[PDB]
Structures are given as structure tokens and as C-alpha cells.
Amino acid sequence: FNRPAEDRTIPLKVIAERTRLSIEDVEYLLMKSLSVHLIEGIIDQMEGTVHVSWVQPRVLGIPQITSLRDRLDSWLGKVNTALLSVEAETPDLVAS
Amino acid sequence: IHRHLSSLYDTLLEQNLCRLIEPFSKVEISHIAELIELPVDHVERKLSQMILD
Amino acid sequence: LKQLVTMEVILWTVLWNEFESEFDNEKNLLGGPLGEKAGEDLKQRVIEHNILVISKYYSRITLKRLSDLLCLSLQEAEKHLSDMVVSKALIAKIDRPMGIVCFQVVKDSNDILNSWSMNLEKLLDLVEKSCHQIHKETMVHKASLEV
Amino acid sequence: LAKTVRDEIAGCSEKAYDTLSVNDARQLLLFSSDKDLLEYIKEEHPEWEIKDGCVVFQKSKDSATCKEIPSLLLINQTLSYARELERIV
Amino acid sequence: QIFSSKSIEKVVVHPLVLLSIVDHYNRVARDTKKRVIGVLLGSTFKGTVDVTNSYAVPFEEDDKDSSIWFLDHNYHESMFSMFRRINAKEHVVGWYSTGPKLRENDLDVHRLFSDYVPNPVLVIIDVQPEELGIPTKAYYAVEEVKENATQKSQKVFVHVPSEIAAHEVEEIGVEHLLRDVKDTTISTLATEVTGKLGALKGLDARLREIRSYLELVIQEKLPLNHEILYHLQDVFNLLPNLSVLELVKAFAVKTNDMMLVIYLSSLIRSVIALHNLINNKMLNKE
């Protein structure tokens, strides 16, 4: 939950230290919480990483609201620059 | 029957080899040999023929 | 039937030890014994059951770790796989020189993309659901402020 | 011209080598003394990191490699192409 | 197995209904902020509500006491009998409201009306639409049992998809009405680009509105229904990483392929257009 959706790959090692729990047993716990329909995702052993397609939606407060404030201002700016690009491109092209 | 047993043997070799090579894009020839338990040299020659074919 | 329906990776020992006794009891029930080969043949379905879970929750598994997770040797663990690509039961590729089992079909760029826009088309729909969801509360809430 | 040549050599070296030995760095730029190369690095090119006697050129995140640019921008370049094209139609 | 009442999957609203409703609003509420209410007639099939005909059902609501609302059933049942005589196929399907927003007494209207239909549908139609979209929003009452013990089962209106389709006769009449305006020569792109651009105007403004409401929550004026904030967090969670590298090559490949197909098309149009220009030169010289 702490990680964003853009980094739903996590090494098995970090999962171990956070869980203080062994590689075999960390993998066991992962496949269990993926099997129960609690989570959905993939796990890569070669580098030992966990590609979860597992993200939830609830439990957050005023600080996350302000963070979404910043993010929504950012994407309003992105939409603004896209619209301005369209509007600057139009005059030379709709007048023909 | 005997006069075509040879060709049937050959085609079975070919198609089993095709089965065997699918799980890879790179492979070691001796590994193919042990999988099919035929000598590495015959495997090399016959795969060379297959590529030529 | 839950353990096989639910996509649980079943360790053979934990399931078998309990059900060795219940299996043996079926030798005395109507229909005769389940068969001597059944114990070894059942040994595959849990492998088949787990392996399907493996591929779905593992894409690139070390054959060692597969041999570990399949409670079996590398050659048997690989063999149980080799058959499954042979049987078409799963699409995978082993790299014996690396001992790497990749369960993912080689996706063509269009195969990559088809999912991508599908994700967005949901994102578009998702926001388009959140889209109407927001004014409605404004509509409902502002009415509550009208009293 | 000598100063410009040294600057150009530094520019080529940054793109060429991930790391360069300080001896080689002096030799290519023909600096008489170690302190000369150190002073040049400190003033003109602060981005260079000197680790264990070798100049570490901080190569760009994605430059020499091909098809290593932004996706949204290219694809919206295709937007410009397509929309400006058919709107005439 | 309790929900034996067929859930209303979609509602199809046809022009004649909207025209009748608009005329009702004009006659009854041209110069007043009073809303006009009525009854919706039609047939329900496979979860789809066909709202074929509607008739004026006069409405009052005190400008001081919103809880009080003058609508009566005498004329209602009289018209049920009379219209069903005229057209036995149709039956009552819902009651419509002419306004931008719901009111609390809409719930008691729905309760009283459900005696006539076990599954009634409330459709809100904005007689003066300002937003770019469908002017109709469909609703049906659902008894939601909140997990909080202290509140009795509350009936909450749940949005259902609403669609506009016109019968062949209604389509004919609509085009006959819309010839002085409507556009059929638009090459499909102009339409699609316009719709995409309008959608972009929609989503970004929706993000800005959520941001405004988040600032509101920060100040401490308005809280939020757990479900809708859940939904916003869900949208954010499902955000794909636009910086996916292999996915970037996927873009590049599709772009190249599609644009070189377009290159084919441009080449072929060059061929045909130059051919016709040469033939034009022939016809001009001859």
C-alpha cells in the first residue's frame, strides 16, 4: 500500500527484512495472500521481485487529501498545457 | 513396411526435435543430446541439416 | 475441493499426511481400493494444481526454487514442466543453461498495447464513473445545505 | 584556440568513456601538473566526479542509445499529424 | 436470493417523452422556479425500461416548505385507465422530474408511486441543460442497509444508465425538425476528435473538482461518503505507469505500423487524384 502503482515490483529481500522472514516462507506467504483473492499479481524469482497487480482503495486522511490536491493541480496543469498546444496549433490549420 | 520404416524413423526424429526445441530460443547441443540420448555429433549434424532444410 | 478450487499452492506433505489415513479407509468401502498407482498419480494433480498457481503467481521461477517449491528434484521439477508445455497445459520456456522457467508468452508489441489501452479505457471509464459520482454528491449535499 | 581545443576534448571524453584515469585525463588535455587538471575540472566542469584517481564522467540517463526518448511526446506528435491531416478532409 | 425484483439495467428515453416534458414545464413553469412532475408510461423488458409516452401531471411544491408537495392520484389513475384503453401495450413505468437536482421529497414521491409499479424509475430531466451531455439521469430506489446500527434502513436512489434512442418514426420526425441545423457530412474524424476533446474538458475539470473538494475536507467544511472517496482512490491506484519502457517500444511499433498504413493510403490517393487531374486536362483540351 505504501508503494505507488508504478513500483508494484518489490524484491523478495525487502519483503523479508520488513517481515524478518525467510525466502522460502516469504514466497509461501506471498503465494498464499495471492491465492486467497486478497491480492493479484506475479512474482519473478530470477532477480527475486514481486510484480503485484495488487492495489486496494480505502483508509486515508487529510494529508493524503492535500497530496491529491497537489497531484490534481499538477494534472490540471498538464491538461492546460495540452489544451494550449492544441489551441496554438489550430489557428494556422483551421483557417485553411 | 521395412522400406519406409527408415523414413518414418527420420520424420519422428524431426518432429520430436521440433517439440524439444520450442521451449528455448537458445540451447546447448549436448543438452539436446542428453534429452534425446543420441550422440552430440549426430544431433549437431541433423540440426544442421534441418536448418539447411 | 476447496483446496483444489481455491488457487492455493498445496505443499504435498501437509495434505498427504492427513489424508494417507482417509485414503487407506477407502480400501474397505464399496467399490474396492482407489488403486496403488493413485497415491503416486494423485501426487501429480497437486503438482498440476500448484503449478497452475505457480505460473499465475510466478512468471520467471528458478528451477532450483521450482524444484524446492515442487518438493522435487530439478530434473523431475523440469520434467513435470516439460510435459506441460508438451501437453499445452501451460506456455513456458526453460533455460537450462540459466535454469530459468519463464511462464509468459512472448507478447508482440500489439499484445503489450492491447492490454495498455484496455487499461486506460478502464481508466477513462473509471474516471468517467468517478466523473458523475462527484457532481451527484454536490447535488445531494448542496440540497442538504438548503434547509 | 588551445582553451577551445581543451574544452572540445573534454566534451568528447565525457561522451566516450564512462570513467577515465587521471593520468589519461592529463595526457589527453596535455596538463603539465596534476593541480592543473584538478583546477580545470573544478572550474569548467563541476559535474565530473574524481573517484580513486579516475575521472567519473556522469553519462546522460538516455542519449547514445536509440529509441530512448519520451513516449507521450512522440505519440502526441502523431496526434498533431493525424488531427491536422484529416480535419482538412 | 432475496433480490427477486429484477434490477433495472438501463433506461431508454425517447424524444416524444422529452418534448412532452418540456412543453409541460413551459406551460406550468415558464416564469416560476417551480418544478413540473409527471408519470412515465411504457414497457420494461429484460431489465430495460422503454419509456414510450408521458403525460403532464400538475405539480406544486411550497417555496417555503420543501417537504410539502401537491400531487394527487385521481387524475393519475384516470389517465392510467384512459391511456391504457387507447394503447393497452403501454403501462406505467416511472415518474419524471423537471429540474437540475434531486430533493428529499423525491423519496416519498417514489414511495407513493411504487404502489403502482413494484420497480419504478425516477428520471431527472434538466429543461435548460448547460452541460454537454445527455440531459436525462435515471434513478431507482434501493433499500441500503448501512453497517451502522443506529440508523434504520434508508432508501437511497441509485443511478442507472440512461440512453436516448428514437424509433424510425421518431427518428424521421427528429431529422425533419433538425434539418436546419444537424450535420451528416461530417467525416467521422471531426466528430471523434470533437468528442475526445470534450471528454478531456470533462476529466480534467472533474480532477479539479475533486481537488477543490479535497481542499474543502482540509479546511473541514464537507466530509465524504466512504464509497466515493474509495472510488477516487481506486482510480488513482489503477493508474498505469506511463513510463514503462518495453511498453514505450510497444507504442513506437504500433505508431510506425499505423502511420505507414496511412502512408499507403496517401500514396494511393496521390495515384487516383493525379489520374483524375490528367483526365481533367484531357477533357479541358478536348
CB contact burial A2-18 (16+ within 10 A = b; e otherwise): eeeeeebebebeebbee
Say how many residues make up chain D. Answer: 89
Phi and psi, residue E195, nearest 5°: -65, -45
| Among A residues 18-57, those touching chain C with beta carbons less than 8 Å apart | 24, 27-28, 30-32, 34-37, 41-46, 51
User: Under a CB-based contact definition with an 8 Å cutoff, are residues A54 and A39 in contact?
Assistant: yes
Cα Rg for chain A, rounded, in angstroms?
A: 21
Query: Each residue of A33-53: b (16+ CB within 10 Å) or e?
Result: ebbeeebebbbbbbebbbbbe
Q: Determine the Cα–Cα distance for residues D17 and D12; give it in Å rounded to an integer.
A: 9
Task: Locate the chain D residue with the closest alpha carbon to A82.
Answer: D76
Name the amino acid, one letter, at C29.
L
User: Counting every residue, how long is chain A?
Assistant: 96
Calculate the alpha carbon distances from C26 to C1, C42, E139 in Å.
17, 15, 58
DSSP letter string, chain E? ----S----EEEE-HHHHHHHHHHHHHHHSSS----EEEEEEEEETTEEEEEEEEEE--EE-SS-TT-EE--SHHHHHHHHHHHHH-TT-EEEEEEEESSS--THHHHHHHHHHTT-SS-EEEEE-SS--SSS-SEEEEEEEEE--S-TTS--EEEEEEE-EEE---HHHHHHHHHHHTTT--S---HHHHHHHHHHHHHHHHHHHHHHHHHHHHHHHHTS----HHHHHHHHHHHHT---TT-HHHHHHHHHHHHHHHHHHHHHHHHHHHHHHHHHHHHHHHHH-
Question: CA of C63 to nearest chain A CA: how many angstroms apart?
Answer: 9
**Paired residues of E50 in beta bridges:** E12, E43
Chains that touch D (3 or more CB pairs under 8 A): A, E
Residue E92 burial (CB count, 10 A): 20
Residues 6+ apart with CB under 8 A from E218: A62, A65, A66, A69
Chain A residue with minimal CA distance to D73?
A82
Report the candidate in E161, E138, E148 with the shortest Cα–Cα distance to residue E225.
E148
A79 touches chain C (CB under 8 A): no
Q: Which D residues, 57 through 76, put their C-beta within 8 Å of a C-beta on chain E?
A: 67, 71-72, 74-75
Give me D42's grid cell: 573544478
Residue E152 CA to residue E198 CA, distance in Å, equals 42
B-chain residues near C86 (CB < 8 A): 19
Three-state secondary-structure class, residue D51: strand
CA distance E248 to D69: 9
Q: How far is CA D39 from CA D10, E63, E105, in A?
A: 14, 84, 82
Name the phi and psi angles at C58, rounded to 5. Answer: -125, 135
Are E26 and E32 contacting, i.e. CB atoms less than 8 angstroms apart?
A: no
Helix axes E188-219, D71-88, angle to 10 degrees: 140
Place of cell 425484483: E5
List of residues 6+ apart from E250 with CB closer than 8 A: C109, C110, C112, C113, C116
Q: Which amino acid is at E199?
A: A
CA gap E99, E105 in Å, rounded: 13
**Resolution of the experimental model in angstroms, please?**
3.3
Read off the amino acid at residue E250: A
* Residue B14 and residue B53 in contact, taking contact as beta carbons nearer than 8 Å: no
Beta-carbon pairs below 8 A across chains A and C: 43
**First CA to last CA distance, chain A:** 53
CB proximity list for D37: less than 8 A, separation 6 or greater: D22, D25, D26, D29, D31
Solved with: cryo-EM
Evaluate whether A41 touches A10 at the Cβ level (below 8 Å). Answer: no
Verify whether the Cβ–Cβ distance C8 to A32 is below 8 Å.
yes
Q: Does E102 touch chain C (CB under 8 A)?
A: yes
End-to-end CA distance of chain D: 57
Name the β-bridge partners of E138.
Answer: E123, E160
β-pair type (E10-13, E48-57): parallel
Distance CA(E278)–CA(E286), nearest Å, equals: 12
CB A31 within 8 A of CB C57: yes
Contact A70, E236 (CB under 8 A): no
- Are the CB atoms for A77 and E211 separated by under 8 Å? no
Q: Say if residues E152 and E1 touch (Cβ distance below 8 Å).
A: no
**Of the partner residues E208, E237, E239, the one whose CB lies closest to the CB of residue A76:** E208
The E-side interface with A (CB below 8 A) comprises 197, 200-201, 203-204, 207-208, 210-211, 214-215, 217-218, 226, 229-234, 236-241, 243
3-state SS assignment for residue A26: helix
Hey, are the CB atoms on C134 and E247 less than 8 Å from each other? no
Conformational region of residue E252, where left means phi above 0, alpha means psi within -120 to 50, and beta covers everything else: alpha
Q: How far is CA E157 from the centre of its chain?
A: 15
Distance in angstroms (rounded) separating the CA atoms of residues E166 and E173: 9
**Between E211, E226, E237, which is nearest A73 by CB?**
E211
* Orientation of helix E226-237 relative to helix C109-144, angle to 10°: 160
Taking the Cβ of residue D84 and every Cβ of chain A, the question of whether any pair is shorter than 8 Å is answered with: yes
Cβ neighbourhood burial of D41 (10 Å; 0-12, 13-18, 19+): buried
DSSP state of A50: E
Interface test with C, best of B15, B16, B22 (most C CBs within 10 A): B22
Judged by a CB distance cut-off of 8 A, whether residue A86 touches chain E is yes
**Taking the domain E10-178, which CATH number applies?**
3.40.140.10
Give residue for cell 514466497.
A27
Tell how far CA C106 is from the center of its chain.
19
**What span, in angstroms and rounded, lies between the C-alpha atoms of B9 and E158?**
70
Q: Write out chain C in H/E/C secondary structure.
A: CHHHHCCCCCCHHHHHHHHHHHHHHCCCCCCCCCCHHHHHHHHHHHHHHHHHHHHHHCCEEEHHHHHHHCCCCHHHHHHHHHHHHHCCCCCCEEECCCCEEECCCCCCHHHHHHHHHHHHHHHHHHHHHHHHHHHHHHHHHHHHCCC
Residue A95 C-alpha, separation from nearest chain C C-alpha, in angstroms: 32
Q: Do D87 and A89 touch (CB under 8 A)?
A: no
Kindly state the cell numbers that stand for B8.
518414418
Q: Could you tell me how far CA A33 lies from the centroid of its own chain?
A: 19
| CB distance C69 to C51 below 8 Å | no
In chain C, residues with a C-beta closer than 8 Å to the C-beta of E250 are 109-110, 112-113, 116
Nearest CA in chain A to C7: A35
Residues 6+ apart with CB under 8 A from E158: E139, E140, E141, E142
Enumerate the β-bridge partners of residue E121.
E94
Q: Which residue bears the cell 483540351?
A: E285
Residue E220 contacts by C-beta under 8 Å, 6 or more apart in sequence? none
- Residue E219 burial (CB count, 10 A): 8
Joined grid coordinates for residue C118: 484496455
Q: Bin E66: left if φ > 0, else alpha if -120 < ψ < 50, else beta.
A: alpha
